[PDB]
């Protein structure tokens, strides 16, 4: 009975749901040549979180726990804690801790630590290799490559803050990260579990509409494109509103609030993704004050006006 809606926020006022950075732009392109199955930024229109999705954008791609030095290296194993420092529970029916990275790549940031007895602190450059055989956040373990073999203490609270991505070469620039390749959450040769499903346009002439950011790059020639299916603020809003879906497809209009002019229309599917009627790769040109407006629940045969 509660009416459905989407927030009155512009694209630039919103946040990527797959990495803690603002949205920049809207992009559409074909996606039949890869699997689109991100686990962050997944939520139904009536407020059910999916995959590894949680509510605040600052927790995405962060890790916390205690660390142990890996002998012969400058690397450390982190034994993951919950976000609130309670024990991690590996038995919950999720793919990995909520907010775990959902792509294969090298995420560079800073590993910080506080010694509880005197409040002394330290911080070091650190990279997590989410395509590594030993990356196993579902089992409670990840490793960080750092610039020290001696400075981090055992049994002291340690945090990783993500900054950006790196690339170390290949046959071409921009060969990594691979934003549509899921990690193996329990390490090499394991089954991922409890995934949010892959998404694809089912209606002829339609493509996914992506909410796009550019991840900072920290070294090399990385592919910094990062597309999410829902802004983080839409996840937060649907969770809060929990308005029942009256059909499987919500018709949205993208509107200029100064003129009331509709720039394009699109479909917001109840399971939490957007499609437009377009063929090809296209960067949308929008007024910066434009926003999305829910206009009607529609049936399964609605043809959108060309984007």
């Amino acid at each position: 009975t509660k009416p459905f809606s989407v927030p009155v926020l512009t694209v630039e006022e919103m946040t990527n749901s797959r990495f803690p950075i603002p949205l920049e732009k809207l992009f559409t392109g074909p996606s039949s040549a890869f699997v689109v199955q991100p686990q962050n930024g997944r939520c139904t229109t009536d407020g059910v979180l999916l995959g590894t999705t949680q509510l605040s954008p600052v927790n995405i791609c962060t890790f916390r726990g205690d660390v142990t030095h890996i002998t012969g290296s400058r690397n450390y194993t982190m034994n993951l804690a919950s976000q609130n420092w309670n024990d991690y529970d590996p038995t919950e029916e999720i793919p990995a801790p909520l907010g775990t990275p959902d792509f294969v790549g090298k995420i560079q940031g800073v590993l910080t630590q506080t010694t509880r007895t005197d409040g002394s602190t330290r911080g070091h450059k650190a990279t997590v290799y989410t395509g590594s055989a030993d990356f196993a956040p579902k089992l409670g373990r990840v490793q960080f490559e750092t610039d020290t073999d001696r400075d981090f203490e055992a049994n002291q609270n340690t945090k990783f803050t993500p900054v950006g991505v790196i690339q170390d070469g290949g046959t071409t620039h921009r060969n990594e990260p691979q934003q549509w390749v899921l990690p193996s959450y329990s390490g090499r040769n394991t089954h991922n579990v409890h995934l949010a499903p892959a998404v694809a346009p089912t209606f002829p002439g339609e493509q996914l509409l992506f909410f796009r950011s550019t991840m900072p790059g920290c070294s090399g020639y990385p592919n910094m494109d990062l597309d999410c299916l829902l802004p983080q603020e839409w996840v937060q809003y649907f969770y809060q509103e929990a308005a029942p879906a009256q059909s499987d497809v919500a018709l949205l209009r993208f509107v200029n609030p100064d003129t009331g002019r509709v720039l394009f229309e699109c479909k917001l599917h109840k399971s939490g993704y957007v499609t437009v009627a377009h063929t090809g790769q296209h960067d949308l040109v929008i007024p910066p004050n434009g926003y999305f407006r829910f206009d009607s629940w529609v049936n399964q045969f609605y043809t959108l006006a060309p984007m």
Epitope: S73, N75, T127, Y129, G131, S132, A133, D134, Q143, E145, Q167, D168, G169, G170, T171, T172, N175, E176, R188
Partner: nanobody, 119 residues
């Protein structure tokens, strides 16, 4: 768990040869693809050569037939035979698990091995 250990670097004169070795453990060596990479001070790290589990090879544009990557599954070792060396090849060289077809690396790095080519 994964370990990568390079050896065989050294100082050589322009036009000389080196043979690099890389000992890899912690994986199923025979099903992995491997790559060689290099980085000089103040420059970006770059890929040099790759080899599939089938022992097919592929090289960066600057190799120009002078280097040969190979593998010995029996010994869990990858090799880079380096001929006709030039000063532009000076760098720390590293081996890693790699993902074909573009050969991005997968693991934290080993210590690498220094190659220095005098003019």
């Amino acid at each position: 768990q994964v370990q990568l250990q390079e050896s065989g670097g050294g100082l050589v004169q322009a036009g000389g040869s080196l043979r690099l070795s890389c000992a890899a453990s912690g994986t199923i060596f025979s099903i992995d693809a491997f790559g060689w990479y290099r980085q000089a001070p103040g420059k970006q790290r770059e890929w040099v050569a790759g080899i599939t589990s089938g022992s097919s090879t592929i090289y960066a544009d600057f190799v120009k037939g002078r280097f040969t990557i190979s593998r010995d599954n029996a010994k869990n070792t990858v090799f880079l035979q380096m001929n006709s060396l030039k000063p532009e090849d000076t760098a720390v060289y590293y081996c890693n698990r790699a993902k074909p077809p573009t050969y991005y690396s997968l693991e934290p790095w080993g210590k690498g091995t220094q190659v220095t080519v005098s003019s």
